[PDB]
Amino acid sequence: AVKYYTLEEIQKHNNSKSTWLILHYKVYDLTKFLEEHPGGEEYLREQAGGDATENFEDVGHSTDARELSKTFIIGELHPDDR
Numbered sequence: 803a804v805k806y807y808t809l810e811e812i813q814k815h816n817n818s819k820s821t822w823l824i825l826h827y828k829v830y831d832l833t834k835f836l837e838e839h840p841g842g843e844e845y846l847r848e849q850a851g852g853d854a855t856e857n858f859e860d861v862g863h864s865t866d867a868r869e870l871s872k873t874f875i876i877g878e879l880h881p882d883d884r
């Protein structure tokens with residue numbers, strides 16, 4: 803089973819208690835990761851509530867970071883919004 807979120811609901815998660823973002827159609831809840839992110843939290847908050855795939859790939863994340871990102875997935879972008 804997979805949970806699908808719309809762009810409308812994702813955009814609402816960009817505040818002090820909730821930070822979500824999209825990477826390759828998958829939705830990530832990075833709320834508790836902000837402080838641990840090697841790159842800092844400014845880059846994450848700035849992209850919160852939207853699709854950060856291009857920025858993510860632009861910086862060029864390691865295979866380890868990508869493996870780690872998987873633990874933060876909570877669902878996928880609704881097919882109709884793709």
Ligand code: HEM
Nearest residue numbers: 830840841845849854857858861862863864867870871874
């Ligand atoms: C769940 C997603 C993410 C995880 C788990 C994550 C993890 C990491 C890790 C482990 C590093 C260390 C270097 C490496 O292994 O590549 C890193 C660096 C970095 N990340 Fe992320 N990252 C994520 C999302 C993002 C996003 C969305 C942005 C930008 C919009 C971003 C910007 C950066 C920057 C600027 C660095 C520093 C690169 C440098 O100094 O050369 N990261 N990230």
